Amino acid sequence: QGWLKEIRKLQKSTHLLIRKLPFSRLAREICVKFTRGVDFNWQAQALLALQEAAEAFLVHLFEDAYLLTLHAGRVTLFPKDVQLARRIRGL
Amino acid sequence: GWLKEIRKLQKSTHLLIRKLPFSRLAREICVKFTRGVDFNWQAQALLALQEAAEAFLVHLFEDAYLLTLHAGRVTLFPKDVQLARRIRG
Amino acid sequence: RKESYSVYVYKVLKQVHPDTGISSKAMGIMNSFVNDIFERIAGEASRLAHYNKRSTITSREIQTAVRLLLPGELAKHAVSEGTKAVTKYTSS
Amino acid sequence: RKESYSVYVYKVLKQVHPDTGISSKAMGIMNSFVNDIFERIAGEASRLAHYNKRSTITSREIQTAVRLLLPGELAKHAVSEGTKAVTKYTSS
Amino acid sequence: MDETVAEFIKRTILKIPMNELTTILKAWDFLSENQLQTVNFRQRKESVVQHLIHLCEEKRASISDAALLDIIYMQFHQHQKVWDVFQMSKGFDMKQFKNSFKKILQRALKNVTVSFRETEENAVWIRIAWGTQYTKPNQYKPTYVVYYSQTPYAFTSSSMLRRNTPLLGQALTIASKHHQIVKMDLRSRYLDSLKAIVFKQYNQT
Amino acid sequence: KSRSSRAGLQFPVGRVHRLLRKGNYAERVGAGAPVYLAAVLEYLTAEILELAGNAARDNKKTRIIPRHLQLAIRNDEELNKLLGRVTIAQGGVLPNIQAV
Amino acid sequence: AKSRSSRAGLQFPVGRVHRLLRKGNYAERVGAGAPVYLAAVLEYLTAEILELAGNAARDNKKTRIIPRHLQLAIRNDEELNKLLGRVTIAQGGVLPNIQ
Amino acid sequence: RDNIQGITKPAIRRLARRGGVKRISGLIYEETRGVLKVFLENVIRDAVTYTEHAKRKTVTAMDVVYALKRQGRTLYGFG
Amino acid sequence: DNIQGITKPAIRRLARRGGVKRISGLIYEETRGVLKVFLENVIRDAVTYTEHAKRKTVTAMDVVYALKRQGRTLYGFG
DNA sequence: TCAATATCCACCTGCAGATACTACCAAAAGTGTATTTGGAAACTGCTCCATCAAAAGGCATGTTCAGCTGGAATCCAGCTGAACATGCCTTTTGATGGAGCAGTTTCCAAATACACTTTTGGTAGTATCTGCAGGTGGATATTGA
DNA sequence: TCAATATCCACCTGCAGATACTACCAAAAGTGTATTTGGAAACTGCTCCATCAAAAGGCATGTTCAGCTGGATTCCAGCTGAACATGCCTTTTGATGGAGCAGTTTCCAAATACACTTTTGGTAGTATCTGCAGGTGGATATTGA
């Protein structure tokens, strides 16, 4: 198996799953496109807040979307599932 | 044909549920929260409630028929209405 | 005793579509539209002044609220219009 | 210069679970919880007084806001507690 | 008590001026004078009625007690209603009348509420809350009747609820020593004025 | 000598000022806030009315009704986003059929 | 001399709530009994959540509350989850749920 | 009669058709009624609170509008 | 790059925490796109709150207020 | 493709329910002029924490193979829609109340200001203790046999 | 079924970070007291608009049929996961300066109050006029062949 052990282990935990430097780098790159081309500084708690919120969003979306694979009689996650979940939520 | 009825009902704007049944139901529900007192109802309040309810139901049917096709079907099942409500919140 | 925005809606309509009327049910929708946006913008402007410990609402608060609420190009044009209005109000 | 609700949360905790502590991350969550409900209730109470053309917020507005916000049995118990508090405040 | 009678009593009491609440309460007599003395009648009305409702909760109040209170209230506030006259012709003790009237209405309609109270000049005040064969009665749209046993006259209040007037007239005509009934050419908001002229005609025909 | 005229507007600047003062939004209100807000409201009003009149013209009519407002709003990408949690009385739905 | 929380029988502050209501642009005037009612409500809700969280902590054989426990409490309760459905708890995780 | 069987099959079929639905299962007519009852309960509970606060026995349109606005649903054409 | 630092294993872990057994190979780009969309909306609101005040440092409260606007109240930082 | 039948468009006429236009009015509200006050901008300084570097190793990357699953093609029986005849419930109308909404009075509860306690937040400094990681050590299911 | 291997599960040990406690303090925040004032409760009353019945005809109800679709089975090729060996990128740690935050001035802008003029909302009584309903004529697609 291996998938069930990993699922059980990961639902039991609380820590963040994306690495920190990549997320920081992406967020800064996105910020610079606003601000009229100037580089803002960031507090650390701000980046942690943003990361927590993002991972929560993604986990909940994966939950809502694996309900549509089983609706269609499948086991494998496809992109149409994510698209339709986002549509029905209203995003 | 289903196709003529859909086209006709999408050009229209009138209400589809009859008034008196809706009024009766809404007054039956009210009396449970007022502890036996028969509250009066303006005429422009029941129309508001009806507009809102019909809009809600139409949009829910849309969202659910999106899920019938995802599953390879043409027929709408309760299976599909329940899941849309869960996903909407 | 009752007051509304119908006069000004009718003026604007005769200013964009001179040949075109408007029914009474629709102007209710437009009056409801105007009351809703007012509340949203003023609510955001109330908070920005509270967050920053200010006791006065100015044009800057309204501008920021407009940027936050309205999407995209619509905010851009709204900002332009408001800025022009204030500019030529002050110069009189 | 900074103020919080931690003292009173700690008291309540020692009042329900005398053997049990609380970490610093969690008390931040609880402080955020208290600030959110306050804002909601006071916001509803502000509108009810505006809808009915009143210039004063009383216990009746708070009671109605509690009924509107909170679901079911939780509102029932909250109403009971607030009513008792006011009752024995007045009788002193 | 039931949550539907508590609201009824509260709404009934909130209608009563503070200038005369104690008199009504004393006539009702459901609460003892000691309990009345326990209460404060100077704080705002909501708290006063909260206290009185708590007192009623300590006891066990039934829809009959609240109906008695409502009858007493209307004895003082007659002018709130429009009063109409009925006449009976072609013609029992009070208890027989009571039982016959009640049984007639209960036979015609499954769910009802009836109540009586006596008054000087051999008068009886009646309160009826109308129901159906399927539904409970409405306590907030009743029908009040004033009948003087030693006379064929009966005075009625104008309800915002028809469809039961002929049954009421039939019950009045049968429970008493008569067999027909008609409506007089008199109607007004002032019950005593109708009363005076009606008995002037009765005594001086 | 009116404030809406000084600013070049049709909407009321004084009324907006009074409504901001009476709404418990802040202890004070400046002088440019009412004009700025009135101008924004006028811009949005006219932007909707233009599209509604166009929809009426397409349907061969000279009078606007809520159906036209609904069509305007739902066929414009941004106004729909602004007004996406809103239902418009007597507006109906957009025609939409789809193949399986 | 005597406080108002004590007269009311509370732990939460009645003076601070009054101050925050007056300084928040909620209305022109503020009554005497509003802060008492509101403080009582807040105390009730805090106590409810803390009770549930302490129970969850004990089940896991711990002596100290952490955000995981509050999350479990909130999502295991049919009403608090409805009050706090648009809310994400930092360092709280998810409920175990397969299938 | 139960006051919710007055919401008939044809009406539900019409709402579905306006929603683009081609075929409908026979079990959709009871599900829809429950959905509608829940929606109405939630709105009416809040509407009655607003009017009992004001010490009225009459539900106005503004009470309904306020309730809907709370529930996340904003309705324009009324006032 | 800078969106390819959101790695295949990280996405797979996020999916497993959500209860996902199997995962198509095209999920890694779709997730990246939706994440990039989510951050843009929050970050500009944060920067707006940050510029209204005349400072050049994004604080946690700006993020919290932004999320609260989007309807995503967050507990833990303020 | 043939073709009649609905059905689809288009044009027309008629009319009546609803929109624009005047009058008028008078009540409410907005504007103009002085005066006073205080909130916020502008300037200076300080110290905190956020950017920017350089090592270490632990997680990510790439290749290959085996097996699991998605998708397409059959087939059968269940079930939904369409049509027609009939009758019951909703729509429309007219008649009264009763409850909302405006008015007057007054009284009770709120703002305001000043003087006096008290409580809470922050800072050293103390210590202690809870839980996490490690490792021992006992004992269970599991997919290959 | 057998069972070694993970694997699980429990149990014990040590210690490091984080909790809880005590003392100081001081300031800013809450309490008490007395005065004045204005909002809101209490009571009247009147007109609007809500509710209750009645009459009928239009939409819904019930039955049958047949054609369409949902659901289960079989087969095969594509694609995912698992394992193993590399090594590259993240993490942790430390000197440094830029920006946030506090304090002081002052000056410009907002509130307060009185007079006066303008505007807007509502009613009376019109007069159009736009849009809907019905009627009729011309033209095509799809049903079945």
Author numbering:
A (entry chain E): 45 to 135
B (entry chain A): 46 to 134
C (entry chain H), D (entry chain D): 33 to 124
E (entry chain K): 1 to 91, 99 to 212
F (entry chain G): 15 to 114
G (entry chain C): 14 to 112
H (entry chain B): 23 to 101
I (entry chain F): 24 to 101
Published text:
The histone variant CENP-A is the epigenetic determinant for the centromere, where it is interspersed with canonical H3 to form a specialized chromatin structure that nucleates the kinetochore. As one of two pillars for kinetochore assembly at the centromere, CENP-N recognizes the CENP-A nucleosome through its amino-terminal region, while forming a heterodimer with CENP-L through its carboxy-terminal region to recruit other CCAN proteins. Here we demonstrate that the human CENP-A-interacting protein CENP-N promotes the stacking of CENP-A-containing mononucleosomes and nucleosomal arrays through a previously undefined interaction between the α6 helix of CENP-N with the DNA of a neighboring nucleosome.
Previously, we reported the cryogenic electron microscopy (cryo-EM) structure of a CENP-A nucleosome reconstituted with the 601 nucleosome-positioning DNA sequence in complex with the nucleosome-binding domain of CENP-N (CENP-N1–289). In this structure, CENP-N makes extensive contacts with DNA through the pyrin domain and the CNL-HD (CENP-N-CENP-L homology domain) and specifically recognizes the CENP-A histone through the α1 helix and β3–β4 loop of CENP-N16. However, α-satellite DNA is more typical of the DNA sequence at the centromere, and we therefore determined the cryo-EM structure of the CENP-A nucleosome, reconstituted onto palindromic α-satellite DNA1 and bound to CENP-N1–289, to a resolution of 2.7 Å. CENP-N specifically binds to the CENP-A nucleosome through recognizing the RG loop on CENP-A by its α1 helix and β3–β4 loop.
